[model samples]
Target: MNASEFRRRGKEMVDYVANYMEGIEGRQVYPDVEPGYLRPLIPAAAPQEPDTFEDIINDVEKIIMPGVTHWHSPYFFAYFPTASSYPAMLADMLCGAIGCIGFSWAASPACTELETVMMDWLGKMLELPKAFLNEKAGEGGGVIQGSASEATLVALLAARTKVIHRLQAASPELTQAAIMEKLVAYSSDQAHSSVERAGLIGGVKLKAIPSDGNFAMRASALQEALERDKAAGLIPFFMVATLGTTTCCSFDNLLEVGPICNKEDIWLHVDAAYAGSAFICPEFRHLLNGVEFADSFNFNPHKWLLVNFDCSAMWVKKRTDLTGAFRLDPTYLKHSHQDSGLITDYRHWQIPLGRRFRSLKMWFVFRMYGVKGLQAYIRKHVQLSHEFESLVRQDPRFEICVEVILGLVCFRLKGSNKVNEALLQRINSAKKIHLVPCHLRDKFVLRFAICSRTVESAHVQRAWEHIKELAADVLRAERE
Candidate 1:
């Protein structure tokens, strides 16, 4: 569209989005469609001529939305929260308008500069160690990754490179391939799947340390693995200590695991993808303790900090560890400012060369909602989780699978896995509220995550009532 037409359409689009958010509560939480349901809904080929904007907008409701999962709806309790806010949305519009591919400092100065400062601002908000901030001529800093998966993979690759270089320096006869064969990494058995994937992609062995009763990875289990691996001539090079695990939201014993990693000269990377945003509150900051021993740390602001998606915040104690792993200097892309050491060229710090202006969302969200406001947001979600936990406790037929630390509540009916599975199936089939199941050890458990910025006590209460009703049907059928 031309500039004049774009102006009118942009305003209409904003209103459309606002209305969608306002009325999202009335929509079904889950889709009613089956697999391959979307293929026959639209034309097989592109139209020869331009379709009217009104026609496309109408199709959004008539054809597209029927199969949507409505992730931001009040009843969506499936995975972790994906942040949503008007400020972030407005910033995203500006980001799209600029459309700058900020791979290097010279490509887009404001994009790179704003990202650097904004990361530093975020790092300070979390009260991270001075080594992870980039205010002065520090060698450490933060970068915005696309997701927690990417951050875990990037940290693994960087640690792999660093360990290989260290080994080669001491044993000149050892080939890179030979040293790589002995390289090993670690994470808690309760950690996210992405940790294991990072090892697979890095071509190293990733061992899962057994967790304690609380599902926290302890120092003893990691120590046992290290000694056993060392006895077998394996070189333990990296360990990922999760601040909040995925299935149960259980935290690893970072205070206990950090010193072990430091003493063993292993790189410790902390992944707090979902729970990190809560650290802004002084009460929850203790969860991030022992991070000072870490070589790298990462968390997803997009998951909980009211920023739009595609903003995973990662910080390293030594920025060169990342740039060294991926930096490539091509003549065509080179600029004079790069050699002067004055500006940051983020292309070296990530897996991909190109990056979007994602920091705009962070800047806008942070300014619009001050630090206290953000803390309050996190507090509300945590409080709601406790509210759900309380409701689950009141019903003796159900048992909480884990402690309600943050915004996730894991519970199961006090019965066989088959019965709990049936209950989850019935709940989702009703399309009134949404939830996902996770296997905690051997028990099938339901995860009620407090998602959506608009979710409140009333929604949580209604969801519990709905679940109780479906659960009664499931139990009665089991008796019959």
Candidate 2:
């Protein structure tokens, strides 16, 4: 469509989106459709002729809505929060309109420059060390990654490269393949699966450091692993300390693990993808105390700070570590400003050569919702989690699996795993509220994560009531 038609349709789309948000509470959080449900719903091949916008829009409700898992719905308590806000959405529209392949400084000056400044702004908001900010022109700075998974992978690859170079410098005759065989990385046993995948992709052995009672990786466990690996002639080059793990919101004992990594000359990378948003509040900032010893840190504003997806914020103490791993200077892509040491060409800092103007979302969201406003948003989610935790405590049949931290509440019925599994099935089948299960050691636990920007105490209360009713049904069947 042309500009005139686009303007009219755009306004209509905005109205549709606003209505969807306002009325989302009435809809089911989970889809009713089973696997392979969409195959028969639409035409097998692309349409040969143009279709009216009205027809496509109508199909969205008739076909698309039925198969969608409404993630932004207040009833959605699965996985983690994916941020949603009007300011960020507006910025996204503008980004699409000004589509530039910002692979280099000359490709789009504003895209690269704005991203650098915005990252610095975010780094300051998180109270990151001065080394991670770009304003001072230090060897350190930040970049916006697409996701926490990508950030973890990028950091692992960089560490691998750095360690390889160091070993080669010490022994010039040593081949890269020989050094790589001995390279190993470590993370908490409770760390996300992506950490293991990073090691696999980086072509190194990944060892899981056993966690403590709280599911936290501690110094003793990590040190024990390091000693054993060293005895085996393995090079311990990297360790990922998770601040907020996926299964439970368990934090790694950074204070205990960080110094060990630093003393051993191992690269420490902190992954706080979900809980990092809470650091904006003074009370939660202490959770990140050991970050000072880390070589790299990453979190996702897109996950919790009201920006849309594909914006994981990553910072490194030495920016060259990232550039040195991935930088390639091709003649066609070369620009004069790149050699000046004044401009930033972010292509070197990430896996993908092309990047979008994702920093615009940060700029708009940061300004629209001031720092205090964002803190208040985080505070609300944390408070709601405690509210649910209290409800679980009052019920004797239910036992909290772990300490309530941030927005995730891990709990399960005080019975067999099968009973809890049945309860989860009942709850999801009802479709009033949604949740996912995680295995905490041997126990099957339910994770109630406070997701959605509009979720409040009332929603949490209703969810508990629904769950209680489902538990009664499951228990009744068990007795029979």
Candidate 3:
């Protein structure tokens, strides 16, 4: 297409996006398409000729959009929020327009520098220790990871490396593999699936210590497990404590968990993926209580902070440990400027070699909204979650199952698992207010996460009404 044609089509695309996000509340949160419904929508093979932008956009509306679950819809109360703001979208557009492959400092000067500064700004906003602000030469620092899963993996590997280094200091004859066999890591039973997945990726034994009466991983419970493992000749070395667990927004007591880790000399990593953005606000800062004792911490701004996907921020008290595991060194990849320590080589911070221009979105988001704006976005969702929980309490047929810490209210039909299953099926099939189920202990409950950035009080109230109606329909069906 010519430049004139491109301008016209791009303007139209912008309008389409504006309209989609501007009125998502009117659309059903979930689509009713069945799997394999699109098998015959287009040709099995790629077309020989290039398709016009109009053709592409038309296909998006006709075939692609109908099957999509619109996370931008105000009625989306399903999985954790993946909503984005307009400013973020614009920033993302610029990022695509610029097309920078910012894997190292030399790759894109602005990309690496902006990330270093933004991370420092973020760490300060969250009241994180200066040590994790690795921007100051080798003391420790932060980097942008793709997701909390990757962050967890980074922390686990760092723990492994740190343990090996320490053990080798004393027992120089001990092989790294032998030391790993003696290693044991701990997390709350309330931790996210990612933590356990990280342990598996790092090839270590991980045990989820039982939680307390409040569903938090209590200090005493972790202590007992540590003592037991130590007595058995297993070295209790690493643990992960989550602030905003996915199932219920439940927070493990980081304050208590931190001291235990310190006393035991274990490396503690905090996964605050879902609620970490709230820390900029005073009310939510308490979630980071005792974070000073943690060796590493991570959160995804994409989850709640209005940044788009793949913008997870991880900070480590010791930088070399993580970078040491993911270090990259090639004659061509290295530059004299990077060796001078003038900028961050992010390729050494995460597993992948080609990192996206993710920091651009962060730079844009922070500058666009500032800290207060970000805090407001987080507080709004968290407040809405509490409101939704109260609505659930009024109903007699369902029980609120998980700890409603931030925005997600985990609830289920009270009769039995069959009853709850029927309710979830009925709600999802209706395609009105979409939600998914999560388990708390043995009970399964619909996970109503108050996430959409555009979600308002009216939206939550309307969804609550629709949910009750759907649940009643399911209950009647089961009774019959």
Candidate 4:
């Protein structure tokens, strides 16, 4: 599209988004289309010429809309909330317009400066310990990571490199690869699967410490595991304690995990992807009890902070330590701007060399909503979760499987795992609602997350009613 046409289409797109958010519940939360439904709709080859915008929009409504899972719908209590918000959308458009590639200090001054400053803003809002701050906090710093998975990988690598470097300094004969098996990582069995992925990518061993009734990682379990590993001539280097785990919204006992890691001299990294938004409240902030001891901490504001997707805010106790481990200097890339100390070079801070101006959306969200507005949004979701929990408790046929930490409610059909699995399948197949699952020991549970930014009481109540009906149907069929 040309400049004028672009402006006109952009305005139209904003209106379209507003209408979609409002009408999401009217549409199916999950698509009704079967797999391979769209194969026949395409030409099956590259077009000889570019398609007009009109044709693209038509295809979006036809082939695309039918296949999409309406994640932003009010009834979409699924795996996790990925995106929404008027402020974030506006910022995203502006971000596209700016089109600045922020790799280094000299690449784009505004892009780098805005990202660093906005990260500190988010840090202060979360009441993060000074040790995790990048500015006057002096020793520590924060940066925007692309996702919780990437952040976990980075933290694992940082810990791995640091421990290996220390071991090498102590004994000249040990190479990093040689000591790879010696280095070990720990997390609660209920922790996100991403932790295992991080260890795999970092080329180290990661073990899961079984959880207690509350699903929190116990200090005793971790300590015993560490001792066992050490006895086997292994070197324990890191522990991942989740403030809010993904599967059932369970929490690892960070208070206990923190001091133990501190004494053991193992780096602690906290992953708080889903429930981190609730930290805005003074009461819920306690979930982040061990922020002081964490070597690195990460959460997705884009998930809950009214910011759009793809912005994971990560912080570290020492900035230089992380950068030091992964520093690569080529003469041509080194510039005087970095030496002048006037800007932050983010390329050294992340795996990717080219980064979008994602900070703009976050900055815009923070400035527009402020802390108070963000807290209001979070409080609403928290209340909704409690409402869902009460429904599960009130019903005799359903059992609440996991703790309702924030906006998610993990529950199951009390009869059996098979029964619960059938119920989840029935719900999804109906296409009226979308939910996910988690396995806690022998029982299979369904996850009901209040993910939509525009979700309301009516939508949640409908979802609960639907679940009860679905369970009743499956149980009746099984008994027959």
TM-scores vs. true structure, each candidate: 0.99, 0.99, 0.95, 0.97
Writing each residue's lDDT as its tens digit, candidate 4 over 219-243 gives 8898889889999988888888887
lDDT of 2 by residue, 239-305 (tens): 9999888999999988899999998889999999999988888899999998989999999998899
- Which regions of candidate 3 fall more than 4 Å away from where they truly are? 1-5, 135-138, 477-480
> lDDT of all predictions, in order shown?
0.91, 0.92, 0.84, 0.84
Report the poorest 10 consecutive residues by lDDT, candidate 1: 335-344
Show model 1 residue runs off by greater than 4 Å.
Answer: none
Residue 104, candidate 2: alpha-carbon lDDT:
93
Question: Backbone collision count in every prediction?
Answer: 0, 0, 2, 1
Q: Candidate 2 has what TM-score?
A: 0.99
Error of 2 at 462 (Å): 0.8
lDDT, residue 392, model 4: 89
Q: In terms of lDDT, which candidate is stronger, 1 or 3?
A: 1
- Candidate 3's C-alpha lDDT? 0.84
Better of 1 and 3 by TM-score: 1
Give the number of colliding residue pairs in candidate 1: 0
- Residue 437, model 1: lDDT of 94
